[PDB]
Amino acid sequence: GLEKDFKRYGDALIRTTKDFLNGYKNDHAKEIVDGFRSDMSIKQLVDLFVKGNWSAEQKGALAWEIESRALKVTFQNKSEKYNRLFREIASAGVVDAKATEQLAPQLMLLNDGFGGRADPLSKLVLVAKQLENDGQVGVARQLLEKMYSAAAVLSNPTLYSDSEKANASKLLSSLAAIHAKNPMHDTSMKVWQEKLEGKQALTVNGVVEKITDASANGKPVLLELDAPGHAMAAWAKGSGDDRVYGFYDPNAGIVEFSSAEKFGDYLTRFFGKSDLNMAQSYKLGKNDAGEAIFNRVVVMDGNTLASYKPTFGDKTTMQGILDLPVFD
Amino acid sequence: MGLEKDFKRYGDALKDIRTTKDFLNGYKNDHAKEIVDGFRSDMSIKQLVDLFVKGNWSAEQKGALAWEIESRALKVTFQNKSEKYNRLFREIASAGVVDAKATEQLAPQLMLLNLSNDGFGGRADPLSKLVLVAKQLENDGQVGVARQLLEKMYSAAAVLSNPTLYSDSEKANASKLLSSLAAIHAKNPMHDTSMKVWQEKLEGKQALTVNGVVEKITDASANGKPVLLELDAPGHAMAAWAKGSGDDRVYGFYDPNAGIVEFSSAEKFGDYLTRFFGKSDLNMAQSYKLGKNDAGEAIFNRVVVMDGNTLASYKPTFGDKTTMQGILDLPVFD
Numbered sequence A: 001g002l003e004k005d006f007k008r009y010g011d012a013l014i015r016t017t018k019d020f021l022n023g024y025k026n027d028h029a030k031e032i033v034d035g036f037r038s039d040m041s042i043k044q045l046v047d048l049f050v051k052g053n054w055s056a057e058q059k060g061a062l063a064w065e066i067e068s069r070a071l072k073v074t075f076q077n078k079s080e081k082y083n084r085l086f087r088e089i090a091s092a093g094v095v096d097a098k099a100t101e102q103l104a105p106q107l108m109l110l111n112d113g114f115g116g117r118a119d120p121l122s123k124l125v126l127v128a129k130q131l132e133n134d135g136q137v138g139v140a141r142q143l144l145e146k147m148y149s150a151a152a153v154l155s156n157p158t159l160y161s162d163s164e165k166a167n168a169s170k171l172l173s174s175l176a177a178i179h180a181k182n183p184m185h186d187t188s189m190k191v192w193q194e195k196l197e198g199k200q201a202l203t204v205n206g207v208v209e210k211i212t213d214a215s216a217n218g219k220p221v222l223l224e225l226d227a228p229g230h231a232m233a234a235w236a237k238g239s240g241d242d243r244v245y246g247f248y249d250p251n252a253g254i255v256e257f258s259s260a261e262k263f264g265d266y267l268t269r270f271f272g273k274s275d276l277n278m279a280q281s282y283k284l285g286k287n288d289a290g291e292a293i294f295n296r297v298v299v300m301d302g303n304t305l306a307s308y309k310p311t312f313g314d315k316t317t318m319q320g321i322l323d324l325p326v327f328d
Numbered sequence B: 001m002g003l004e005k006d007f008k009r010y011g012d013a014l015k016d017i018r019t020t021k022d023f024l025n026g027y028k029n030d031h032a033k034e035i036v037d038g039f040r041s042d043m044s045i046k047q048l049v050d051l052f053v054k055g056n057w058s059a060e061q062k063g064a065l066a067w068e069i070e071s072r073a074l075k076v077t078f079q080n081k082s083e084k085y086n087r088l089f090r091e092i093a094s095a096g097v098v099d100a101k102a103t104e105q106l107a108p109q110l111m112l113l114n115l116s117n118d119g120f121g122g123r124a125d126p127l128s129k130l131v132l133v134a135k136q137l138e139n140d141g142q143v144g145v146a147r148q149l150l151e152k153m154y155s156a157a158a159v160l161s162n163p164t165l166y167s168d169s170e171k172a173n174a175s176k177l178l179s180s181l182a183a184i185h186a187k188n189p190m191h192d193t194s195m196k197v198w199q200e201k202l203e204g205k206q207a208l209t210v211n212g213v214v215e216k217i218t219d220a221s222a223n224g225k226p227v228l229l230e231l232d233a234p235g236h237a238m239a240a241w242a243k244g245s246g247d248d249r250v251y252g253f254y255d256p257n258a259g260i261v262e263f264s265s266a267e268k269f270g271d272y273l274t275r276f277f278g279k280s281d282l283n284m285a286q287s288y289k290l291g292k293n294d295a296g297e298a299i300f301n302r303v304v305v306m307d308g309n310t311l312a313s314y315k316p317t318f319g320d321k322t323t324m325q326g327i328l329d330l331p332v333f334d
C-alpha cells in the first residue's frame, strides 16, 4: 500500500523554499527529527510526517527519507542474454541501419588489411572531432557504423545494389589510401603542430594535462598517441558544459567524458598498473623517472589534416572521406 | 606483409571503370572462378594482383578479380569488446557527480529495477506510456526523446541517492521528475473519461500473439504514421512501436529488462520479438506468464493501440498543467 502512503504525503504539502531543500539530504533526519529510526517503513515515515508539527528543514529531512525510498529507481547492467539476442539479429543477413547504431559501440576492430596499427582510424577520428567542434554531430560514431556497413557489404555483395557495393569499396579503399600515403610524410602541407618524442616524449599525465587544459575552452585539442605497432587518439572539443574529453583505441573503442577529472581517472587507470596496465601491454618505454611514455604524441592541426587528400589525382579530402555514404 | 605495394599496383591498374554497371555486376563472390581463366580460390593477394595487371579483362571480369582482391585486402573484422573495458568505463561513470556525456554511453547498457508495490507500480506502467509519447514526438521531428528519458531518470536517481553532491535546484528537479512517474501511476490515463488516450483494447477472443503484434507494428498500411502499442502481461507492461517514413522508418520494442531496441528492418524486428518470447531462445512469454489462445499460442493479456496525440496532451497531476510531453522535457541539471 505504498500508493495510498504517497497520496497522503503529497497532500500534506514549501518544496521549493531554500529552508526545505537544505534539510532535503541523507543522514540528517536522525539528528533533527525527534522520534525517527532508520529502520522505519515508508508507512511509518509518512505517519511521523503527517502526525507532527515540523519546521521547513525538518519537513525536508523526512521528505528525503520518504522520497529516497518511495521514488527509488535502481539501475544495473543488462543481462548478457538480452545483448546476445540483439547482436545475433543485428549481425545477421542484410545490414540494419538503425540496429548498426546500437551495435557499433559494442564492437572492437581487429588487424593484413591496412596498417594493423589503426594508422588511418586514429587520424580520421581526430578529423571527425575537428568537424564536431565546428558543429557537425556524431561524425566519429558514424565512421565506425559506416566501416561496419562497408565490411558487411564487401562480405555479402549479392545482398546489395551496385551503388552500395561502389560506396563500400570507395570508403574501405580510402582507409587503405591514408595508409599508403601517410599524411605525416607530406611536404606540401604540415598536418601536425608538434611531434613529442625522445626527451620530449609525454607520459599519460602529460597527455591528460594537454587534453584537459582549461585555456583551450572552445578550441579542439587533437592528439595521436603512438605505441609500438598500435595507434590511439585523444581529444577535447566543444565549449562550457558541452566540452567533452575523449579517447579512442581499437580495443576499447570511443570513450568520452564531460568531466576532465573522470577523463584523467580513466586514462591513468587504463595505462596504469593499478588497473588495466595497458601501458605495459602496448609495450611503452619509460622516461628517466621510470614513468611510461608514448613512442610519439602528435599534436595535430585539425584544419590542415581535414583538407589533406590521401589519393593523388582524386579531390576527396579526409573530411570528404568522413562524409562518404554507404547506403542511399 | 607486402600487401601495401600490392594494393598500389592494383589501384594504378584502374586509371571511372569502378562505377560502370558492367564492372559492379561482376563485383560479387563465387563469380571469378567462372569468368576469369587462370583463377584459383587458393591464390594469395599478390598472385591475384599479378593476374589482374598481367592480363586483358572485360568490365565484368575486372569486377570479379576486384572483389576477390578487395574482399581480402580491405577486410575489416569486428568482435565483442572485452568486458574489462566496459567495467572500467562503468566504474568511472558511476563514481561521484553524474557525468552528462558519460551517461549518454552508460544509459543504453543499464536496465531498470524497483519494488513489487513501488511508488509507480512494479509493472513499468508509466514508462511504457512515456516511451510511446516519446516515439510520437520523435515521429513528429524531435530526436532522442526516449534515450534522454532514461538518461534523466538515471540522473534523477543518482541525485536522490547522493543529494549532498548537487544544488537545491537539482534536488528539486530530480524529485519533480520521479514524482511525475508516480503521478502517471496514481492517475492511470487509461481510466480518464475526459479524453480517450487509446484507439483499441485487443483482449479476450481478440487478444494478439507475438506474431499478431509484429504484423500490427510492421503493417505497411501505416505509411509515415506512428504505431504505438502497450503490451500488457500479468504485472508487467512493455511497449512496441513504428515511427518515421521510408528508409527512416524504425520498428522498436521496450522492456525494463531488455531496454529500448529498434530496427530499420521489419524482418529483423519480427525475428527479435519471436525469439524474445519464443521457447527457441529467451522464452520470455513463459517468464512473464503469458496465457495461451485456443491454438496454444502465447497471447498478451491486453494490447492497447494508443493515440500518441491524445496521450501526449494528458495531464497526470490534476490542477498542474504539466502534460506527458511536458514530463519528457522536465530538466534535471542547470
Ligand SMILES: [Cl-]
Pocket: A158
Ligand atoms: Cl548471383
Ligand SMILES: [Cl-]
Pocket: A258, A259, A260, A261, A262
Ligand atoms: Cl570536472
Ligand SMILES: [Cl-]
Pocket: A325, A326, A327, A328
Ligand atoms: Cl549511409
Ligand SMILES: [Cl-]
Pocket: B058, B059, B060
Ligand atoms: Cl569492356
Ligand SMILES: [Cl-]
Pocket: B087
Ligand atoms: Cl562489474
Ligand SMILES: [Cl-]
Pocket: B167, B168, B169
Ligand atoms: Cl544551491
Ligand SMILES: [Cl-]
Pocket: B188, B190
Ligand atoms: Cl489498466
Ligand SMILES: [Cl-]
Pocket: B209, B211, B212, B297
Ligand atoms: Cl498468429
Ligand SMILES: [Cl-]
Pocket: B107, B108, B109, B110, B150, B258, B259, B260, B261
Ligand atoms: Cl535501453
Ligand SMILES: [Cl-]
Pocket: B152, B331, B332, B333
Ligand atoms: Cl538534463
